[PDB]
Amino acid sequence: KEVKVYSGRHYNTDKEVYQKFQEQTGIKVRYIETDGKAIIERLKREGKNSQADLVILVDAAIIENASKANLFQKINSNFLENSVPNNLRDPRNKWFGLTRRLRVIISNPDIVDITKIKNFEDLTNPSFKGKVCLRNRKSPYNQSLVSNQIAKKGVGQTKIWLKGLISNVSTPYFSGDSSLIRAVGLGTCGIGIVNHYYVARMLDGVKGPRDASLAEKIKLIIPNPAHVNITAGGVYKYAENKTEAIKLLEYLASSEGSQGLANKTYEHPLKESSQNRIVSKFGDFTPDNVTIKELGKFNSKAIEIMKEVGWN
Numbered sequence: 001k002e003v004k005v006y007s008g009r010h011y012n013t014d015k016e017v018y019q020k021f022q023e024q025t026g027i028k029v030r031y032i033e034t035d036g037k038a039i040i041e042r043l044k045r046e047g048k049n050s051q052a053d054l055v056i057l058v059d060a061a062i063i064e065n066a067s068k069a070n071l072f073q074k075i076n077s078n079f080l081e082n083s084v085p086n087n088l089r090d091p092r093n094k095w096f097g098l099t100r101r102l103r104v105i106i107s108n109p110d111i112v113d114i115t116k117i118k119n120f121e122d123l124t125n126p127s128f129k130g131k132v133c134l135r136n137r138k139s140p141y142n143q144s145l146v147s148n149q150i151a152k153k154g155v156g157q158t159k160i161w162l163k164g165l166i167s168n169v170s171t172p173y174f175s176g177d178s179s180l181i182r183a184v185g186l187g188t189c190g191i192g193i194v195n196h197y198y199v200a201r202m203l204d205g206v207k208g209p210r211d212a213s214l215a216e217k218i219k220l221i222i223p224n225p226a227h228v229n230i231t232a233g234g235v236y237k238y239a240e241n242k243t244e245a246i247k248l249l250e251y252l253a254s255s256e257g258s259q260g261l262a263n264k265t266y267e268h269p270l271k272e273s274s275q276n277r278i279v280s281k282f283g284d285f286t287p288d289n290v291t292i293k294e295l296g297k298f299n300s301k302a303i304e305i306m307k308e309v310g311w312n
């Protein structure tokens with residue numbers, strides 16, 4: 001018995017989590033870890049000839065892309081249906097959340113007055129002119145943040161917010177979250193928007209001493225209420241080892257599996273906040289209840305309006 005996993009979680013192998021499943025069940029896990037978009041393109045090409053059984057992907061936008069491409073099959077699982085929060089799974093049962101991440105505000109309190117920053121709406125304040133820095137619009141994390149705004153506020157209000165935000169940027173767009181953290185730490189940027197776990201990695205020395213020192217200078221602000229995004233798994237449309245893939249998915253979504261995955265990347269597990277001391281110091285959060293499916297729905301519109309206001 002075996003199961004083949006094609007995973008878009010490629011920060012640093014989930015190998016230990018898969019080995020625990022293997023030891024417990026006797027099911028051999030064959031994994032590949034690489035960029036999610038490369039997986040999607042490979043599966044579209046292979047179709048029925050693919051050897052994927054389980055597909056894991058990062059970000060609402062990428063999950064949506066896989067869904068549109070008909071990559072998943074509907075599954076029935078009383079465990080998943082009763083254990084994964086409704087907002088973090090497909091209402092039609094094709095994919096299921098495994099970990100949670102927050103896209104948050106980071107600030108350098110020597111450059112900006114952090115007492116004025118509580119939520120994303122605050123970033124349009126004219127006192128931050130020239131002090132806001134962003135990663136580029138190609139990032140699914142940013143697209144999903146804008147989709148989040150559209151879901152709640154509608155297109156009109158989101159566009160007003162976007163115009164205000166981009167008015168405050170005077171620095172070229174960044175190509176990654178870690179480089180943006182460095183710039184905020186250094187003080188070339190006063191304010192950035194990044195995923196929470198990148199800050200925790202740097203603080204924990206994972207990227208070496210200079211990055212740790214830079215990350216120590218930053219104040220992380222969790223917007224209240226918070227925007228939540230996920231990594232998710234689903235069974236491939238033509239999976240040969242369907243039964244085994246469901247068993248593995250059930251394990252990954254369980255308390256043990258979700259904690260195992262999340263502790264590797266400094267993410268939050270599905271149903272509890274991280275026990276990691278570095279992550280817990282960032283503070284409590286309350287989700288805004290926008291569903292992951294909704295984030296996917298508005299992805300195309302988010303890209304259109306980001307382009308229109310000049311988020312490049």
Ligand SMILES: [Fe+3]
Nearest residue numbers: 011058177195
């Ligand atoms: Fe990431």
